[PDB]
């Protein structure tokens, strides 16, 4: 009886088996509904397109994200997401397979209750475990101690772990990641004349953010160079054939992760959150956590972000001590890879939430069996 | 209006059939307008003859390609609207962005106004000038496109799925003749 790992992230659902290297099915989490009038009778008109089908036909669809900042809002859409990732992507019966789901920390508990109730009553399993994503990132990193900054599409959270022990008072959560960067990239893309208002255009601005944006090492000098010379400007071809040219927006978009006052949020940047999480830890273990900054998540794919994290923390830390940013090349799927490591662990078989334990304890054992 | 230029007068409704026959048989769409005007002004290789039912013979020159040019240039008959190529292009920009490529590869014409044997290449040139250069302008022009509206009607009525979409006698009897707004497009 092999195991399934299904990271139900805000942006990209990543699912696959246990023990495998790369995640088998990676597809975005969108439910698309038609908004125009179907005139051509027959043809099998779906009322809702889920996944890559909604991605391809996105020009005539209202797209909806069921998960917003790690909290599942629309439960029928998320039921259709689970139905698609089980019965169409992986083509597996969930009644003969355990499932490991991932969850952001500091979540609403009723969300955890509802994934428990749906996952044991709609897609009923032999077993399921809900786990924190940062622990899975530290699993895939292989090291035991370390602070993990995980930044998906909705949640950027810091969790520090020392020698196998998490510190729950030092866990912090920030609702600022790639969806807000997409919205801010639209809002600064209106300066050059390019308008993007629909839900379909979120995909195009997201592709612009994925393909062209990068983290500046120094923001002010990059501002001066992009204002002075047109060397940093890059051209991108739209799906209709038009060509946009973006300059400073390549590095004004990710700088919201280091300066959240751009979109008006009061809280400080991710480097200050990492440093404050380390100062919230005990004084002996900060030597291990400075040397083992593990990033994960698809938001850290920008090709300047490790040097910026090193520079900001080395600015913040005392200068008598080394800072080392662990940035593996496959850190997008490191939540999935550590989930596959955990599901292949022989010790992990004893803390599965059984259906028997769910029936005997209600949907309430998930607060006590999990973290 | 422009057949009176050479000397031929047609004012009655019976003569409209003759002028329509001349338009059907002899007219064609110029690929380039000004080069064809200069060619017809230079030499009479483009002039063609047609025999009237009484027995007179007309010969027309530039009027072969001035008459279908009004579709691409409506200011000849004094209408403020744009030509059919700009109408097609503006209908593409009024759509959403992500589908526009499929609108470029599937330009479909129908009706007997596109029977002129230069109109597909001209519309390809006009849209290719209008569209960005990285894109494919494929215009479908079947030989049967004079009757394709009826052919698609026979296509739609041969469906099994369309038999529930009719407006029956009984539904008209409750709803009055107003159900055709809510049932049809």
């Amino acid at each position: 009886t092999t195991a399934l790992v299904c990271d139900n992230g805000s942006g990209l659902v990543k699912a696959g088996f246990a023990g495998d290297d790369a995640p088998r099915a990676v597809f975005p989490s969108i439910v698309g509904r038609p908004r125009h009038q179907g005139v051509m009778v027959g043809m099998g008109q779906k009322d809702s397109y889920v996944g890559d089908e909604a991605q391809s036909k996105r020009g005539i669809l209202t797209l909806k994200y069921p998960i917003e900042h790690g909290i599942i809002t629309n439960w029928d859409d998320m039921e259709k997401i689970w139905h698609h990732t089980f019965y169409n992507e992986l083509r597996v019966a969930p009644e003969e397979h355990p499932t490991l789901l991932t969850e952001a920390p500091l979540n609403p508990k009723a969300n955890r209750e509802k994934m428990t109730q749906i996952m044991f009553e709609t897609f009923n399993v032999p077993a399921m475990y809900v786990a924190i994503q940062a622990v899975l990132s530290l699993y895939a990193s292989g090291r035991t101690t370390g602070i993990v900054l995980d930044s998906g599409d909705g949640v950027t959270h810091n969790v520090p772990i020392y020698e196998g022990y998490a510190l729950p008072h030092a866990i912090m959560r920030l609702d600022l990641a790639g969806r807000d960067l997409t919205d801010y990239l639209m809002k600064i893309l209106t300066e050059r004349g390019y308008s993007f208002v629909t839900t379909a255009e979120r995909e195009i601005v997201r592709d612009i953010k994925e393909k062209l944006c990068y983290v500046a090492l120094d923001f002010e000098n990059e501002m001066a160079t992009a204002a002075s010379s047109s060397s940093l400007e890059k051209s991108y071809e739209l799906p209709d054939g038009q060509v946009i040219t973006i300059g400073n927006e390549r590095f004004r978009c990710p700088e919201t992760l280091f300066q959240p006052s751009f979109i008006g949020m009061e809280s400080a940047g991710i480097h200050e959150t990492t440093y404050n999480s380390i100062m919230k830890c005990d004084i002996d273990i900060r030597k291990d956590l400075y040397a083992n900054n593990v990033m994960s998540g698809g938001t850290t794919m920008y090709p300047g972000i490790a040097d910026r994290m090193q520079k900001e923390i080395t600015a913040l830390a005392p200068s008598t001590m080394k800072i080392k940013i662990i940035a593996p090349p496959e850190r997008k799927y490191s939540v999935w890879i550590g989930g596959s490591i955990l599901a292949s662990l022989s010790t992990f078989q004893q803390m599965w939430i059984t259906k028997q334990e769910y029936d005997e304890a209600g949907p309430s054992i998930v607060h006590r069996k999990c973290f | 209006k422009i057949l009176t230029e050479r000397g031929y007068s047609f004012v009655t409704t019976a003569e409209r059939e003759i002028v329509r026959d001349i338009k059907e048989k002899l007219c064609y769409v110029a690929l380039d307008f000004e080069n064809e005007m200069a060619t017809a002004a230079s030499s009479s290789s483009l002039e063609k003859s047609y025999e009237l039912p009484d027995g007179q013979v007309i010969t027309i020159g530039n009027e072969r390609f001035r008459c279908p040019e009004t579709l691409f240039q409506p200011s000849f008959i004094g209408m403020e609207s744009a030509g059919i190529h700009e109408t097609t292009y503006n209908s593409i920009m009024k759509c959403d962005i992500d589908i526009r490529k499929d609108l470029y590869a599937n330009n479909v014409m129908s009706g007997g106004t596109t029977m002129y044997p230069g109109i597909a290449d001209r519309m390809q040139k006009e849209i290719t000038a209008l569209a960005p250069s990285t894109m494919k302008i494929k215009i479908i022009a079947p030989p049967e496109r004079k009757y394709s509206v009826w052919i698609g009607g026979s296509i739609l009525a041969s469906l099994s799925t369309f038999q529930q979409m009719w407006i029956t006698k009984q539904e008209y009897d409750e709803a009055g003749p107003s159900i055709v707004h809510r049932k049809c497009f």
Partner: peptide
Amino acid sequence: RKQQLAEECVIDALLADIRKG
């Protein structure tokens, strides 16, 4: 736990109508 371990389509429709005439 020891006892439990011991236990373990526009195109198709339109071409169909075309060949129907």
